[model samples]
Target: MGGGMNFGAFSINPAMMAAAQAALQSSWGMMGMLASQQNQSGP
Candidate 1:
């Protein structure tokens, strides 16, 4: 697919979008792992 984006009123760089989403997911995924481990030990 081609890069870049247009949202009628806004435009964005595809590479930045990819990086931002990847980091967001990685952070939340790690938090989920820790939360699950904690839940297992909670009564």
Candidate 2:
């Protein structure tokens, strides 16, 4: 034992990071698809 109990350190899991990245990618993809569709339709 030290100044404070050595509680096991925690770290950011890779799976969580990957899921966040995938969500962002999906959002961007949907946005791009909508923009493309709008362009094709024209004003």
Candidate 3:
């Protein structure tokens, strides 16, 4: 999935864009969990 799009290093693919967006969503999801844990552990 990570190496599905490849064309001479420089290219414009919509699928790549979708994957990047998905990564950001996953990152935020993990961040949310961390925030909740921190709130319980500290002020």
Best by lDDT: 3
- On residues 1-43, what C-alpha lDDT tens digit does candidate 1 reach at each position? 2344543122466356656656678888887778778765464
Q: What TM value does model 2 have? A: 0.32
lDDT, candidate 3, equals 0.60
Q: Looking at candidate 1, what is the lDDT of residue 38? A: 71
Per-model CA lDDT versus the true structure = 0.59, 0.54, 0.60
**Candidate 2 local distance difference test against the native:** 0.54
Greater-TM-score candidate between 2 and 3 = 2
What does candidate 3's lDDT look like per residue over 1-43, in tens digits? 3444464133446556556666678878787778778665465
lDDT of 2 by residue, 1-43 (tens): 1223232221344345446556678878887788779665555
Clashes of each: 0, 0, 0
- List of clashing residue pairs for candidate 2: none
Q: Candidate 1 has what TM-score?
A: 0.31
Q: Provide the global lDDT of candidate 1 against the true structure.
A: 0.59
Q: Is candidate 1 or candidate 2 better by lDDT?
A: 1
